[PDB]
Enzyme design. Structure first.
Site, PDB file in Angstrom:
ATOM      1  N   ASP A 249      30.963 -17.988 109.251  1.00 56.69           N
ATOM      2  CA  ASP A 249      29.793 -17.424 109.911  1.00 56.69           C
ATOM      3  C   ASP A 249      30.009 -17.427 111.420  1.00 56.69           C
ATOM      4  O   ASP A 249      30.263 -18.480 112.015  1.00 56.69           O
ATOM      5  CB  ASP A 249      28.542 -18.217 109.538  1.00 56.69           C
ATOM      6  CG  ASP A 249      27.265 -17.588 110.072  1.00 56.69           C
ATOM      7  OD1 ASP A 249      27.333 -16.492 110.665  1.00 56.69           O
ATOM      8  OD2 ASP A 249      26.187 -18.195 109.894  1.00 56.69           O
TER       9      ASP A 249
ATOM     10  N   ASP B  89      21.858 -17.338 104.012  1.00 58.89           N
ATOM     11  CA  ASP B  89      21.933 -15.981 104.538  1.00 58.89           C
ATOM     12  C   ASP B  89      21.589 -14.948 103.471  1.00 58.89           C
ATOM     13  O   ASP B  89      20.996 -13.908 103.780  1.00 58.89           O
ATOM     14  CB  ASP B  89      23.327 -15.718 105.107  1.00 58.89           C
ATOM     15  CG  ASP B  89      23.594 -16.503 106.376  1.00 58.89           C
ATOM     16  OD1 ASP B  89      22.624 -17.006 106.979  1.00 58.89           O
ATOM     17  OD2 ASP B  89      24.774 -16.616 106.769  1.00 58.89           O
TER      18      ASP B  89
ATOM     19  N   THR C 185      27.600 -11.595 108.818  1.00 56.30           N
ATOM     20  CA  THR C 185      27.997 -11.579 110.221  1.00 56.30           C
ATOM     21  C   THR C 185      29.469 -11.238 110.403  1.00 56.30           C
ATOM     22  O   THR C 185      29.852 -10.754 111.473  1.00 56.30           O
ATOM     23  CB  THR C 185      27.696 -12.930 110.872  1.00 56.30           C
ATOM     24  OG1 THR C 185      28.406 -13.965 110.181  1.00 56.30           O
ATOM     25  CG2 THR C 185      26.204 -13.225 110.820  1.00 56.30           C
TER      26      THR C 185
END
Lengths: 525, 48, 507, 528
Positions: free
Chosen positions: D49, D385, D82
């Site tokens: 991430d 997420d 991401t």
């Protein structure tokens, strides 16, 4: 673990460098010596020559590689990677606990076994002797080891060079040994590949003497090679001029002119077309030389005169006298033609006879690329040597296809040799697996795609059909890289039996020497 | 970038001259000019 | 080592590439480079720039080695060879990030150059006939090069004098050593003279300077290497002497040896006597009474040019001089420029060479003038064996650039992108021109796409009117045959640099 | 101070951002891998991430902090994927250096990118997927298999696909003036060592990890209408006065009177009827023995943040101190809530109270079991997420095919768009279209495949779709397979990404590259 192990890391640095320098897809390198010598080539042999040798096994590899240049010299990195792969396999064998003696026995017993397996892969048994046409076809795949950009133009330059030197004499003429040093390539800056030509005589770069070389169109001349250089007459020891009176002062300069009148006219009395002068001469020599139309060779080198004796065919007179009609060479035409912007004196003839020791003018844009071509000519004539002095070198499948069949042969030899040979022989076939992976790594293909292609051809089996496709098919990349298989018979890519025959003895010798080292001893070094 | 690590990205003339480090004695008085432009005008500082 | 080593070799060429950006084109600027000879080189063409440039990284010598090959080959506009080769390496940076090997890149640029050799023959046309020829075609080709470097305004007077000097060159001979000239310092920048023979500066002074006649109607040329001075003999001058009167005889013998040779110089009667070695003041006052031209300390190259002009020879013995060793010319007029006298040989038996006498104090001006004459002989050589030309200004490469995009579009997949990068790399030539001319490269290159497709072929780029027009109809042309060896040489050099993954430096 | 002007600032800024960008590019796509960071302080976290990595990484040149704040903005917008987002704006700086060397003005570079993204909104609407569109059985499972990508948890997709979908179905609440949405960040994720992911438990409600202080207390509470009371009041010997301070029997009576009231304060909780009571600060065995006779389940050493979500979900009033309008200390019955079902289950050598059927605020908790902490470090942030993607999926049914389908398609729209604008901005569109194609090319780099071979074939299939408006289908096709290296429709592979995630990815990437292009010079003042 601090000697027999860490010594491999010293070669591992050079072993990884040889992986990218091998094959037509290999990478070049830049070399800067300590004296300022710059070398750019894809061959690791010249690299190890100028490189400072620290680890003792580095000198072992360059001397074993030098033995190949004396004999074969084609693909010397093949055995170097094979010898370096044995060290990577050695880390696996040492971890298993095999003694250094038994590991050598595994390679030694496999060496004599591999030499016997070279007879099963023999293809192209018969070959012509004096036929140039078949020779030009078999020399073409030899260039593929080096830069393959143009293999046709390099073959045409050899065609005109061999045609002059070749004694011909069809059927049985008691053909002598073909001289390698006779063919000499000269690097000329500028021009394209097609601009290169072949000189039947000796190509020299210098200034003509009187005006330019001419008058040889009518041919019928005589040229004698002089071993004793023409220079100012003097004794061996250094002398001093002692004049007894003032009358001899004016006769000293005139006395030297009397020697010029005596010496230069006596040597010019026979009217030799080309005179060989190894030393310097005075300016008064142009009187008699230009009167009789004699061409002068001004200050040659030592090695160029040995090759001149086979061109002009003149007896190497030990002393300088008057030219003797008994011993004379036969030379027809001597001309000077401008090529790269300067007048180039050439001894090339036009028909009339065939002499030996021809030359080749190599014209190229990049001087660094000419070094690889210069080494290609040395390896090009080496391919003819295998078919000349020996009875024959025959052929073997190239592109690593020969080592693929050996993997199955070495595997079968390991099942029949129990004991410590089981780990030695089975891993000995693994040393042959780096050869096809080296060609696939330089080409950029995935090993996962090449692995089943290597297993398909020679590993599976050989069907009962005559002349199976497995033997005539191999690994080549042009447009077929997706399939991974290509026919080597249509492309006619073959290697001589002497290539691998000398390499197997080196692979064991390189492994026996390194793996037997207990420690390195250096006193004041 | 100030001494404390404050990062300010702008084309404003009054903001740039505020944190600008000037070693020239007379050029330090130029900051007062930008200070008067914000108090009197206060608009179009990039053009003024 | 690895992909980073190739970029390091390319970055070494970028420093040379960025320095040669102004060096291409008529409107390109100049760069200042100082050397170890204390000679400041301000020049346009990058011919002599790469020779005098200081090389730092070893891989940068690759562009220097290929420069000398194109130096004697073309010599004019060869700075674009390294620029194009630099673009091929610069545009190869995104290719190095991919899995494309340099050999796949080698086959990509080779197929574009192999076709380019055929396109240049197709893009050009045989002129010959009653069209531009000698005294015309030679003036149009020489004006492009010369006027694109220095003497921009006065090129009308300056180039016209140099073109008239090349007109003396004739076919069936075409000797390449005829371009030898000399450097004359001092004088006005706009003043230049024409000389058809060897000129050599005094470089020394002696008491008989002002007494030396400058004008000979029918001189006789004689070349001698004998040095005139009082000095010891060749090997050993030791003389065993008994009587006392014989020592003065030695002084007489040393004089009689020289004085007899001094009479032999005046006995020949040649109105031109040149000495290869220096000349001392001992023979000055004697030989001056004979009133014959003499020059000492003459370079060996100038003596060889006289041998190749009047057919003379150098002999160390006066009694051995043959009747043909005395040459004659049409007229001898000694010119004095800035208190420096210059000999002039006019009407040699065979002279195809023309030595241009320049003026001005700047030494870097003759660098391109000698290079312009080196290109002038290339124009004559390439106008005979094969008769054809192309348009000038540097827009010829843009015509074949789009032709490579059309053909390679349908050819074998990925090979389209590699060849398209080559055609994209060919756009750097007009790109550097638009940058130095203050133009807009976006609008011009977009109009060239229509100018090289719907605009047929010959339309080029006109720098004077800031518009796009035909340089072929403008009569300003550029040699076509010089681009054949220029485009092919940059490919083999680029493929060699991209194939080097490691660099070894000992010590 | 130190001030440098010219291209030296923009060159050092791009090379600094590109160097740190190439480090996180190895995590792109399903074939990406995690990396380790050495903080030199003894702490380390292995994850792909970019939000945490860019926050931990020390930024050398101050221009690198712009991309760090870009990852923080993605968390407030989407927060997932991401690896496929923040690396898009990093490629715009590489090709920008070639445009700065040209005569194109920096604002023209900016203006060319502004009209590119503004028009790219309609380009996305052409390939835009509706709410129904493909088969979409539950429409969550098809997206759940996509959330397994970009992470190393894809091998567990046979489970996590059912885990996240079935858990978030009970999160639906009515808030924001009658708006139906999932309250993201209210889901509590628990971790357990041992076995594998197949042992995870789905809790349609809140689940707190804790046990009883005394082993003699009943650990089982069953039935409905279970009331819970959160008490944050610290029970301990009271300190002295402001420092004025004050018969040791009367002095000891202070503790006797205080502890006597503490026992009476617990008796007020007994009359309330709550089955579960909570206590923040620890207590001795005196107050613990009273909880045993109270027949109420207590817990000590409680975290304050855990109890804040209890009062929100259940609806009971959190009581930090016992007081009323008078001077009497007691607990009113109006501070307790109600729940449908509350039961404590034993999981992984431990026990946790499952609070389900919350009337005030509905939510859900996911109790997962895994190998160990280091193996669940990646599985933790990844599941947190994935909660946003499922939210954005049912909030807006607009999705787009992943795996480089959008980047390969936008190139074709910009090819005709470049010639439309023309003039000097045509070159900016060409560089912007080629920069978007770098992301799918780097996708095959991590997979050790040939991207240009796939892009040439994939774009040819998208071209045949746009070139023919009327279209059965002899042409139209899309999708890219990393494993087999072939072009197949993603309806069979099941890879689809929400549109709102990709639109906000390129929307925020526009101002990211502009912030660097607007920097003329950089000056640094030495600290005091």
């Amino acid at each position: 673990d601090g000697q027999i192990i860490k010594s491999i890391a010293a070669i591992r640095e050079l072993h990884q460098m040889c992986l990218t320098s091998m094959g037509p897809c290999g990478r070049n390198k830049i070399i800067v010596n300590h004296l300022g010598k710059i070398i750019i080539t894809n061959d690791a042999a010249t690299m190890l020559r100028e490189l400072d040798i620290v680890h003792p096994a580095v000198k072992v590899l360059v001397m074993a590689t030098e033995q190949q240049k004396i004999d074969m010299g084609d693909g010397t990195n093949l055995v170097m990677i094979l010898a370096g792969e044995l060290l990577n396999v050695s880390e696996k064998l040492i971890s298993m606990g095999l003694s250094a003696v038994e590991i050598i026995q595994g390679y030694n017993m496999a060496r004599k076994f591999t030499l016997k397996e070279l007879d099963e892969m023999v293809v192209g048994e018969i070959t012509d002797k004096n036929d140039k046409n078949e020779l030009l076809k078999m020399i073409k795949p030899v260039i593929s080891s080096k830069k393959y950009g143009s293999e046709d133009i390099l073959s045409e330059l050899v065609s005109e060079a061999v045609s002059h030197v070749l004694p011909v004499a069809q059927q049985a003429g008691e053909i002598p040994y073909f001289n390698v040093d006779s063919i000499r390539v000269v690097k000329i800056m500028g021009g394209s590949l097609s601009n290169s030509t072949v000189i039947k005589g000796m190509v020299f770069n210098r200034e003509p003497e009187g005006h330019v070389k001419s008058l040889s169109e009518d041919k019928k001349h005589k040229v004698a090679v002089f071993t004793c250089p023409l220079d100012i007459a003097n004794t061996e020891t250094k002398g001093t001029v002692l004049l007894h009176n003032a009358q001899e002062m004016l006769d000293f300069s005139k006395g030297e002119e009397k020697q010029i009148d005596a010496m230069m006219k006596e040597i010019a009395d026979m009217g030799v077309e080309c005179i060989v002068a190894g030393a310097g001469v005075g300016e008064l020599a142009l009187h008699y030389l230009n009167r009789y139309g004699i061409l002068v060779l001004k200050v040659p080198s030592k090695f160029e005169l040995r090759r001149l004796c086979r061109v002009c065919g003149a007896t190497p007179l030990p002393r300088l006298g008057a030219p003797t009609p008994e011993e004379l060479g036969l030379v027809e035409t001597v001309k000077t033609m401008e090529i790269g912007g300067d007048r180039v004196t050439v001894f090339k003839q036009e028909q009339g006879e065939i002499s030996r020791t021809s030359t080749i003018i190599l014209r190229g844009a990049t001087q660094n690329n000419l070094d690889d071509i210069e080494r290609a000519i040395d390896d090009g004539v080496a391919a003819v040597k295998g078919l000349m002095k020996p009875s024959g070198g025959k052929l073997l499948p190239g592109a690593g296809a020969t080592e693929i069949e050996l993997i199955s042969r070495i595997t079968k030899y390991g099942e029949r040799t129990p004991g410590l040979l089981q780990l030695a022989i089975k891993q000995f076939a693994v040393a042959f697996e780096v050869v096809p992976r080296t060609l696939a790594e330089t080409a950029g293909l995935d090993v996962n795609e090449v692995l089943p292609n290597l297993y398909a051809a020679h590993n599976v089996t050989e069907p009962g059909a005559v002349k199976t496709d497995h033997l005539y098919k191999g690994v080549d990349i042009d447009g077929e890289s997706d399939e991974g298989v290509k026919d080597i018979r249509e492309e006619n890519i073959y290697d001589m039996l002497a290539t691998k025959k000398f390499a197997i003895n080196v692979a064991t010798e390189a492994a026996t020497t390194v793996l037997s080292i207990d420690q390195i001893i250096m006193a004041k070094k | 970038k100030t001494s404390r690590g404050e990062i300010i990205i702008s084309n404003d003339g009054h903001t740039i001259l505020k944190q600008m480090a000037i070693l020239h004695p007379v050029a330090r008085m130029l900051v007062e000019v930008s200070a008067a432009q914000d108090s009197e005008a206060g608009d179009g500082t990039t053009s003024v | 080592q690895g992909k980073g080593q190739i970029i390091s070799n390319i970055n070494a060429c970028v420093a040379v590439q960025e320095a040669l950006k102004p060096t291409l084109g008529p409107l390109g600027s100049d760069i200042l480079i100082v050397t170890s000879n204390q000679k400041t080189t301000i020049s346009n063409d990058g011919a002599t720039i790469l020779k005098l440039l200081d090389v730092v990284h070893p891989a940068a010598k690759t562009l220097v080695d290929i420069s000398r090959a194109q130096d004697a080959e073309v010599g004019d506009g060869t700075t674009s060879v390294t620029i194009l080769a630099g673009e091929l390496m610069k545009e190869a940076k995104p290719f190095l990030e991919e899995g494309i090997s340099s050999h796949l890149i080698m086959k990509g640029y080779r197929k574009a150059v192999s076709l380019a050799v055929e396109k240049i023959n197709e893009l050009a046309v045989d002129i010959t006939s009653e069209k531009s020829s000698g005294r015309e075609l030679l003036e149009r080709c020489a004006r492009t090069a010369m006027s694109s470097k220095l003497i921009h305004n006065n090129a009308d007077f300056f180039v016209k004098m140099c073109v008239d000097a090349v007109l003396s060159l004739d076919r069936n001979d075409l000797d390449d050593k005829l371009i030898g000239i000399k450097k004359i310092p001092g004088g006005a920048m706009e003043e230049s003279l024409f000389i058809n023979g060897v000129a050599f500066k005094k470089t020394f002074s002696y008491a008989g300077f002002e007494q030396q006649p400058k004008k000979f109607n029918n001189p006789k040329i004689l070349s001698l290497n004998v040095e005139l001075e009082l000095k010891a003999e060749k090997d050993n001058a030791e003389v065993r002497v008994e009587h006392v009167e014989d020592y003065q005889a030695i002084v007489d013998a040393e004089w009689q040896l020289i004085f007899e040779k001094l009479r032999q110089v005046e006995e020949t009667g040649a109105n031109i006597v040149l000495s290869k070695l220096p000349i001392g003041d001992l023979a000055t006052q004697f030989f001056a009474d004979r009133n014959i031209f003499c020059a000492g300390r003459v370079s060996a190259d100038d003596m060889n040019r006289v041998i190749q002009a009047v057919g003379g020879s150098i002999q160390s013995t006066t009694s051995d001089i043959k009747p043909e060793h005395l040459g004659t010319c049409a007229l001898f007029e000694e010119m004095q420029i800035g208190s420096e006298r210059y000999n002039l040989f006019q009407g040699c038996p065979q002279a195809k060479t023309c030595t241009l006498l320049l003026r001005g104090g700047a030494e870097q001006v003759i660098a391109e003038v000698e290079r312009s004459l080196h290109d002038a002989i290339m124009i004559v050589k390439r106008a005979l064996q094969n008769k054809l030309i192309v348009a000038g200004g540097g827009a010829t490469e843009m015509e074949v650039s789009k032709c490579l995009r059309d053909y390679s579009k349908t050819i074998a997949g990925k090979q389209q992108m590699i060849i398209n990068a080559f055609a994209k790399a060919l756009e750097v030539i007009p790109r550097q021109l638009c940058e130095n001319a203050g133009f807009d490269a976006i609008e011009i290159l977009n109009k060239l796409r229509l100018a090289h497709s719907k605009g047929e072929k010959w339309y080029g780029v006109v720098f004077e009117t800031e518009n796009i027009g035909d340089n072929f109809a403008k009569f300003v042309w550029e040699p076509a045959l010089v681009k054949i060896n220029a485009l092919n040489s940059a490919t083999e050099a680029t493929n060699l640099i991209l194939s080097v993954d490691e660099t070894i430096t000992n010590k | 101070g130190e001030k440098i002007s010219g291209d030296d600032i923009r060159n050092q800024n791009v090379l600094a951002t590109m160097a740190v960008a190439n480090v996180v590019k190895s995590s792109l796509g399903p074939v990406g891998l995690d990396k380790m960071l050495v903080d030199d302080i003894g702490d380390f976290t292995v994850t792909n991430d970019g939000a945490t990595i860019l926050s931990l990484l020390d930024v050398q040149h101050p221009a690198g902090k712009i991309l760090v704040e870009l990852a923080q903005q993605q968390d407030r917008e989407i927060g997932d994927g991401t690896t496929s987002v923040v690396i898009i704006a990093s490629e715009l700086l590489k090709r920008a250096n070639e445009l700065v060397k040209n005569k194109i003005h920096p604002t023209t570079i900016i203006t060319g990118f502004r009209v590119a993204l503004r028009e790219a909104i309609r380009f996305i609407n052409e390939v835009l997927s509706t709410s129904v569109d493909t088969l979409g059985k539950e429409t969550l499972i098809n997206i759940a298999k996509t959330s397994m990508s970009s992470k190393i948890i894809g091998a567990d997709s046979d489970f996590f696909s059912n885990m996240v979908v079935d858990a978030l179905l009970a999160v639906k609440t009515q808030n924001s003036k009658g708006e139906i949405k999932y309250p993201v960040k209210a889901v509590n994720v628990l971790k357990a060592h041992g076995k594998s992911a197949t042992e995870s438990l789905l809790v349609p409600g809140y689940a707190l990890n804790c046990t009883v202080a005394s082993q003699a207390m009943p650990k089982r509470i069953a039935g409905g209408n279970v009331k819970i009371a959160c008490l944050d009041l610290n029970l301990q010997k009271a300190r002295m006065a402001m420092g004025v301070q004050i018969d040791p029997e009367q002095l000891e009576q202070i503790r006797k009177r205080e502890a006597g009231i503490v026992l009476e304060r617990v008796k007020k909780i007994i009359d309330a009827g709550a089955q579960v009571v909570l206590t923040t600060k620890g207590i001795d065995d005196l107050c613990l023995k009273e909880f045993v006779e109270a027949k109420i389940m207590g817990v000590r050493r409680c975290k304050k943040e855990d109890l804040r979500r209890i009062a929100r979900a259940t609806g009971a009033t959190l009581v930090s101190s016992m007081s009323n309008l008078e001077g009497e200390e007691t607990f009113e019955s109006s501070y307790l809530g109600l729940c449908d079902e509350v039961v404590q289950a034993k999981f992984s050598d431990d026990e946790c109270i499952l609070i389900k059927g919350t009337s005030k605020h509905s939510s859900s908790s996911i109790i997962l079991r895994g190998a160990n902490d280091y193996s669940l470090d990646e599985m933790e942030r990844s599941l947190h997420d994935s909660l946003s993607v499922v939210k954005r999926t049912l909030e807006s049914g607009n999705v787009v095919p992943g795996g480089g389908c959008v980047e390969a398609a936008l190139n074709i729209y910009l090819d005709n768009f470049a010639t439309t604008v023309g003039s000097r901005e045509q070159l900016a569109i060409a560089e912007f279209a080629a920069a978007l194609l770098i992301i799918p090319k780097t996708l095959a780099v991590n997979a050790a495949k040939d991207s240009s071979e796939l892009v040439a074939k994939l774009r040819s299939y998208h071209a045949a779709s746009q070139m023919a408006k009327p279209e059965r289908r002899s042409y139209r096709n899309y999708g890219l397979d990393l494993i087999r290296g072939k072009i197949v429709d993603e309806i069979h592979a099941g890879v689809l990404e929400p549109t709102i995630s990709k639109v906000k990815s390129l929307k925020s990437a526009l101002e990211a590259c502009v912030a660097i292009l607007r920097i003329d010079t950089m000056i640094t003042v030495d600290p005091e």
